[PDB]
Design a protein around this ligand. Structure first.
Ligand SMILES: Nc1ncnc2c1ncn2[C@@H]1O[C@H](COP(=O)(O)OP(=O)(O)O)[C@@H](O)[C@H]1O
Ligand SMILES: Nc1ncnc2c1ncn2[C@@H]1O[C@H](COP(=O)(O)OP(=O)(O)O)[C@@H](O)[C@H]1O
Lengths: 437, 65, 431, 53, 82, 125
């Protein structure tokens, strides 16, 4: 289906029901405390009571945390949205930094709009008035109300139609042999097209005949959809009106992004509260992940204080493998992972540890399964040694090139010699540094 | 608790398809049943062309022993 | 409902008695009693609203409720009075100069209330007849007191026929505008036909005489007026926030016109309040510009927050108290916040537990309070809900101190995190 | 449970005038013409429930 | 002119009615008449099943170009005969 | 797959109101006639098509894809700026499967806005 990705193997956090961590489950090993912490976090998300809390992961190079966040989302399922993020995205040439941050927070809150509807459909069979001279005075040439014979594929019928609606249906091109969208409770009516049946015998029919409606007339069921309130903000902020002169004017100019005022946000809040309290809609707050938080500047951290304090900010997470380095923007200020002390104070933290070589053997086995490539044991031990001296990813990449070399040999399983030529072909951190040295 | 029967007409919409298709004739032809050893000569409304075909329905001559 | 339990949801005001003595607990607040006194004085003076341009700063240790104090202030203030809080980093924008941004914020803070009389009628749609050929029309209405009958205007005819109102309904029309509004159907109105049509509720027949005059009042901010009249169809830019370099001649023209409207009872102004967080994030340019930004009469009171001490002036190499040049410093007064005591911490945490609606053991309170005191209050606030979740996983109700220790071990803290980073310095690069 | 080999009937609807037809079974007739025989059982009058209430 | 009565009698209950100017106004306003009359099918004679293409003169739905040629043969033969 | 129609119209009668166009789309072999929708009539008029011309008609859209005139003049031959074409053959309706190739960039830009194509040509997105 998909060419294997760096984390396709993972499929789930695999915490036991009691919350404890099965040693291996859906592509995981070690870090049992981290897995249980992630369990607590997903519990908190499903709680939905809290708001604006955030965590940070501290782990050495060779992220891994990518896998942890991905598994968190996978356990979360698709019932709740989730968006990734990369620090370089903040550096944009069209909108200010804080604009990007607030926008990404806004896009993280989803919603679910439930709206019921009802209509009458069919093909216009006939049409008649209910004439009556009862009205006061005047020649009694008056219509009490109209009778409309409508037919769906289910069958045929007619309904009582008030006098005023005949003028409406005049407005539309209502004619024998076409179908219509009669809103029961509202009275909206339209003209889709003439019944396909006539076109059936047509040798040439340039028009596009609508087919015959099927099923009962009295139904339009309940409509449903979901969006991120950021899309709502985009739609509402700039009225569309694609026909107006202003629309032509917009298409003359190159579309861009404008720093959306906060009053529009407050108004969106009010209107969504009004819809939700009526039960029409449903909010499904998401969570956010921003990697290499260390890549940000001081401005964004200080603004993140305010953004976090808000009682609408969805949960968010971060990750960093940077030591007590000088904070970007700051000429000298140094702090763990380049995060100011004050921001560090009001956030949670979790840590990951180094990995033992046996864990490497386990993970490599999992990866070989994932690729669906058979491995001879000598290859397993040799690559275990390689990862021992090298990093994990270095050892991992050697899989597919070696498998391919073996396919060239006609073999199926990879052996010690294959990995030997692969090793001499490519160099690790220390060997590459030395050859550079 | 009735039973609808097959309908072929439905509507006056079948002007054609007949002039090219002759109605194969039927005749009240005589015949004999093998199951009748004396071969009594009886009659069928066969479609003319289906003349001389052995009595197709007398193949059930299974009996006790 | 869009809201959610927030860090500062527990705040509901300031808890000050009439003599402004703070109460040891009130509308979710206690502590910094001197700060509560000062804040009460500030709020009183804001109510007085007889003076302009005053400014004040709050300094103290980080994470000591400075934001909480400000939010209690804003809550107690009330919705009528305009208010606005912004962050220092937010002014820096790629669409406008910083000075324009500061002017925009200032003008946003202030508000204007417009009063104007009205002239309207409302009643049942007793009967209507329209006579398309122009169109001749006849109509009548009534109320719970009497009834009347009127002709129908041609533009009234177009208005109503586009409204497509049904006889028997209850509506209200303004003569000058000639714009109608449906105010809810009536018994006969929604009695409808045999034909389905729809279903709806009812409203009571109006009362009093049809004509009612009546007065309407509105409110708008100075920046809103500026933007709306600026570009002549810059109105839609209000939401898009694409306003740029709103010229100064416009500012002065609006100021003149608003003043003259003011002294003639046409409308009443209101001095808003503006709060800026992380004020140290401003450079020297903004300090210079705002230093004079206080003389203009339209000067909402300013409130600033920063915990620094003798820090380099942003954009230069000069250390100054809280990194703000002395020129501003002499133009404003200060308030200090002390680190909290022991028992007060117990009170605060009990209040937050009430907020969370999670009630647990006394030994847990003692141990958690001592731990938070040693480490920080904020880590204790984090541990509250975490312990709640763990205990609910236990399937019991009362959280136990053993569970607290479990969660504490689960989530290392700042001191533990740095101690770890020490455990292996070479773990992370650029140390 | 009565055990009638030939009286095995079933529900269905029709193509053009689709609707619950009731317990019915096809059967051949004279002239080699198939005919649908719609039965009449304990639920004859209530042949519209749907969704297996 | 077009005399129309939108006199909505709300009478208790709501009611409305329309009184057209005259029979002419009613008819132009409510003319209707006769149903759609969906057509009948047709098929190609020679190949004995429908053809998208159809004779430009006699409209016979001829399928193949060769069908066209042979039907033209039969046509001209018929006219030559009669 | 496209499955469009084409041919050479011998002539068309102006549908005096009556959308019966003399769709004498005579290919080299064959011919027929049809109706002619009002949209079709206005399309023919605006394109200023001529009788005895070779044109191809979109099946569903009915767009009059202009193609010039017919061989009746040249293998009389009327020489001018307009392009000239001979008569196609046989089935007016025919099928034609086509393929395209586009990086994700093309789809992104095309669906980016109303006229992303000229943005590509100018490379100014
Ligand atoms: N920095 C790290 N800290 C802890 N564990 C890691 C780290 N990097 C990788 N892992 C482990 O390696 C396995 C696969 O992760 P991987 O796909 O290699 O992530 P990445 O490619 O970001 O290093 C995971 O089971 C994880 O436990
Ligand atoms: N005395 C107090 N009473 C109640 N809540 C408090 C008190 N002090 C602090 N808090 C809580 O702790 C937080 C302290 O953060 P704060 O010091 O205002 O942040 P900053 O340093 O950015 O101003 C407040 O948001 C408030 O919710």
């Amino acid at each position: 289906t998909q060419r294997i990705a760096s984390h396709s193997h993972v499929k789930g956090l695999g915490l036991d029901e009691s919350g404890l961590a099965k040693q291996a489950a859906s592509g995981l090993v070690g870090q049992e405390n981290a897995r249980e912490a992630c369990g607590v976090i997903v519990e908190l998300i499903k709680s939905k009571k809290m708001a604006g809390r955030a965590v940070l992961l501290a782990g050495p190079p060779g992220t891994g945390k990518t896998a942890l966040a991905l598994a968190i989302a996978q356990e979360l399922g698709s019932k709740v949205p989730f968006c990734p993020m990369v620090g370089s995205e903040v550096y944009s040439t069209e909108i200010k930094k804080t604009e990007v941050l607030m926008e990404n927070f806004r896009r993280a809150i989803g919603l679910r709009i439930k709206e019921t509807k009802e209509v009458y459909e069919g093909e216009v069979t006939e049409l008649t008035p209910c004439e009556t001279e009862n009205p006061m005075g005047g020649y009694g040439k008056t219509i009490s109300h109209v009778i409309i014979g409508l037919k769906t594929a289910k069958g045929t019928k007619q309904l009582k139609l008030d006098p005023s609606i005949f003028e409406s249906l005049q407005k539309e091109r209502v004619e024998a042999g076409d179908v219509i969208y009669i809103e029961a409770n509202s009275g909206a009516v339209k003209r889709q097209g003439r019944c396909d049946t006539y076109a059936t015998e047509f040798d040439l029919e340039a028009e596009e005949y609508v087919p015959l409606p099927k099923g009962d007339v009295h139904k339009k069921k309940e409509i449903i959809q979901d969006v991120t309130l950021h899309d709502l903000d985009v739609a509402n902020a700039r009225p569309q009106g694609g026909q107006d002169i202003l629309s032509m004017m917009g298409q003359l100019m190159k579309p861009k992004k404008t720093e959306i005022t906060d009053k529009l946000r407050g108004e969106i809040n009010k209107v969504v509260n009004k819809y939700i309290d009526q039960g029409i809609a449903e909010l499904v707050p998401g969570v956010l992940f921003v990697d290499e938080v260390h890549m940000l500047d001081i401005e964004c951290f200080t603004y993140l204080h305010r953004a976090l304090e808000s009682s609408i900010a969805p949960i968010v997470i971060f990750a960093s493998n940077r030591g007590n380095c000088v904070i970007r923007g700051t000429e000298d200020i140094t702090s763990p992972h380049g995060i100011p002390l004050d921001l560090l104070d009001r956030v949670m933290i979790i840590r990951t540890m180094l990995y033992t070589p046996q864990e490497m053997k386990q993970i490599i086995k999992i990866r070989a399964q994932t690729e669906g490539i058979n491995i001879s044991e000598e290859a397993l031990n040799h690559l275990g040694e390689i990862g021992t001296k090298t990093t994990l990813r270095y050892s991992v990449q050697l899989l597919t090139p070696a498998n391919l070399l073996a396919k060239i040999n006609g073999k199926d399983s990879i052996e010690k010699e294959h990995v030997e030529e692969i090793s001499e072909l490519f160099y690790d951190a220390k060997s590459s540094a030395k050859i550079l040295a | 608790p009735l039973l609808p029967s097959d309908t072929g007409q439905g509507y006056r919409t079948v002007k054609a398809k007949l002039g090219s298709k002759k109605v194969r004739p039927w005749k009240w032809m005589p015949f004999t049943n093998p199951a009748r050893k004396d071969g009594a000569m009886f009659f069928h409304w066969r479609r003319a062309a289906e003349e001389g075909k052995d009595y197709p329905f007398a193949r059930f001559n299974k009996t006790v022993q | 409902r869009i809201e959610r339990i927030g860090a500062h949801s527990h705040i509901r005001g300031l808890g000050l008695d009439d003599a402004l003595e703070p109460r040891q607990a009130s509308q979710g607040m206690v502590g910094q009693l001197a700060a509560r006194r000062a804040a009460g004085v500030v709020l009183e003076m804001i109510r007085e609203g007889k003076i302009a341009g005053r400014a004040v700063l709050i300094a103290g240790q980080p994470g000591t409720g400075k934001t909480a104090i400000a939010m209690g202030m804003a809550q107690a203030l009330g919705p009528d009075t305009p208010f606005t809080a912004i962050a220092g980093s937010e002014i820096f924008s790629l669409e406008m100069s910083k000075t324009e941004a500061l002017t925009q914020a200032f003008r946003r803070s202030i508000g204007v209330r417009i009063k104007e009389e009205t002239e309207i009628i409302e009643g049942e749609v007793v009967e209507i007849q329209i006579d398309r050929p122009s169109k001749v029309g006849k109509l009548t209405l009534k109320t719970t007191e009497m009834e009347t009958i009127y002709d129908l205007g041609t533009k009234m005819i177009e208005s109503l026929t586009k409204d497509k109102v049904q006889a028997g309904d209850v509506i209200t029309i303004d003569k000058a505008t000639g714009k109608i509004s449906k105010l809810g159907r009536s018994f006969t109105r929604a009695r409808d036909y045999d034909a389905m049509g729809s279903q709806t509720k009812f409203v009571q027949c109006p009362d009093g005489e049809l004509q009612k005059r009546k007065e309407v009042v509105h409110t708008v901010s100075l920046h809103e007026i500026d933007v709306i009249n600026s570009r002549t169809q810059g109105f839609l830019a209000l939401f898009s926030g694409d306003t740029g370099e709103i010229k100064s001649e416009v500012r002065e023209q609006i100021n003149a016109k608003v003043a003259e409207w003011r002294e003639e009872g046409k409308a009443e102004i209101i001095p808003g309040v503006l709060f800026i967080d992380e004020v140290h994030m401003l450079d020297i340019e903004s300090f210079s510009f705002l230093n004079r930004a206080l003389e203009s009469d339209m000067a909402p009171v300013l409130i600033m927050a920063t915990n620094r001490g003798i820090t380099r002036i942003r954009g230069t190499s000069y250390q100054s108290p809280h990194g703000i040049p002395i020129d501003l410093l002499d133009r404003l007064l200060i308030v200090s916040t002390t680190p909290y005591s022991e028992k007060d911490t117990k009170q605060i945490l009990r209040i937050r537990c009430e907020e969370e609606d999670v009630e647990m053991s006394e030994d847990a309170y003692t141990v958690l309070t001592r731990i938070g005191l040693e480490t920080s209050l904020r880590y204790a606030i984090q541990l509250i809900t975490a312990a709640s979740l763990v205990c609910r996983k236990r399937k019991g109700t009362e959280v136990q101190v053993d569970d607290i220790k479990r969660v504490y071990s689960l989530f290392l803290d700042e001191s533990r995190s740095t101690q770890y980073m020490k455990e292996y310095q070479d773990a992370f690069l650029f140390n | 449970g009565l055990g009638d080999v030939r009286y095995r009937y079933c529900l269905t609807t029709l193509t053009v005038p689709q609707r619950c037809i009731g317990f019915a079974r096809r059967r051949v007739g004279r002239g080699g013409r198939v005919l649908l025989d719609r039965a009449h059982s304990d639920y004859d009058s209530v042949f519209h429930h749907l969704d297996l209430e | 002119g077009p005399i129309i009565t939108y006199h909505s009698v709300t009478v208790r209950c709501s009611r409305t009615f329309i009184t057209f100017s005259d029979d002419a106004t009613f008819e132009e306003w409510f003319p209707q008449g006769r149903p759609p009359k969906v057509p009948v099918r047709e098929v190609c004679p020679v190949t004995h099943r429908p053809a998208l293409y159809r004779d430009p003169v006699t409209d016979i739905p001829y399928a193949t170009a060769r069908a066209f040629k042979i039907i033209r043969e039969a046509y001209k033969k018929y006219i030559t005969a009669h």
